[PDB]
């Protein structure tokens, strides 16, 4: 019959463009189960508050609710409210945070695996911290030691591996993989291998 | 009329115990809409996959789905599936990633504000990276310059400010605030000020 009491904010882990808000359910539900959570955030200096609804069942099974699309290095204020059949409840105290800056991506971990034949190798990618911004491409470079670099390969962020077929036999190669985002390139992850004799 | 194809993972941002997965949805085939997305993850080396459902609509507006309850410094494989009225589509290929290690928290930023009376001040906290693990406490310490440290105050993580009242008038003070999690304490943030006459 009543509206919910305020949710309580426990954590606010800020990232570059997203922020994870950890909270506790309201002490009082008002008499009707909590259906959704209204998140409100505002850039320090703005008047209007941005909002978004979150499903109560999913929110509680996660313990968190992630607000997205924020600007890096900005001070924000964020608060919550619970909505039940009767209506919207009292809003929480406004927690304040500042988002992190976008940094270059860290290097990916590389894992070698056998390819179809002895003169080929498959390099599996193990993703790493991207710096706070989506990864644009993966730049792969390789060569047979003491020899020229084959043409550089560009890979989509979603790529999980890179195959290097039709190589020279009984030859030693080195592969360089770099992760790149809107901010720049990462340190290169190198990997060295040797094809079979025949 | 059938189940949808597999989604496509475009990004996986790993943190310490969570990971943000970005992806492309499949075509909505079969005349019916996509209802949910199934996220599956397994620490590389295990056999049993974990899982969680994500409302399709919410995911589509968010742009990501966040898997939680992961262990730090661990290699995981994640894959996604799309659900619709006719049933669960095919899982996507595994995407591997490694969670970050847990670090100490970063110090919080302090901002001063007037208090109820001229002999008090309100110290607002501007929260910051917690090092990948929940903040346990906010250790605060203040004092009038050229005197001993007042007793330490322990603020719970949900605190947004520290109020210092019943201070001497026309006196100079400084505040020290440290954020602390399981990993340890951060470097302290300072704030010096002077009460009114």
Numbering used by the authors:
A (entry chain A): 497 to 694
B (entry chain B): 497 to 693
Describing publication, verbatim:
The neural cell adhesion molecule (NCAM) is the prototype and founding member of the immunoglobulin (Ig) superfamily cell adhesion molecules (CAMs). NCAM is present on the cell surface of neurons, astrocytes and oligodendrocytes, where it mediates homophilic and heterophilic cell adhesion. We conclude that the NCAM–FGFR1 interaction at the cell surface may be transient or stabilised by avidity effects resulting from receptor clustering and that conformational changes within NCAM may have a profound role in FGFR1 activation.
When examined by size-exclusion chromatography, all three mutants eluted as a mixture of monomers and dimers, similar to the wild-type protein (data not shown). There is no domain interface to speak of in the mutant (240 Å2 buried), and the conformation appears to be stabilised entirely by the crystal lattice. The neuroglian tandem, which has an extensive domain interface that incorporates a bound sodium ion, adopts a conformation that is intermediate between the two conformations we report for the NCAM tandem.
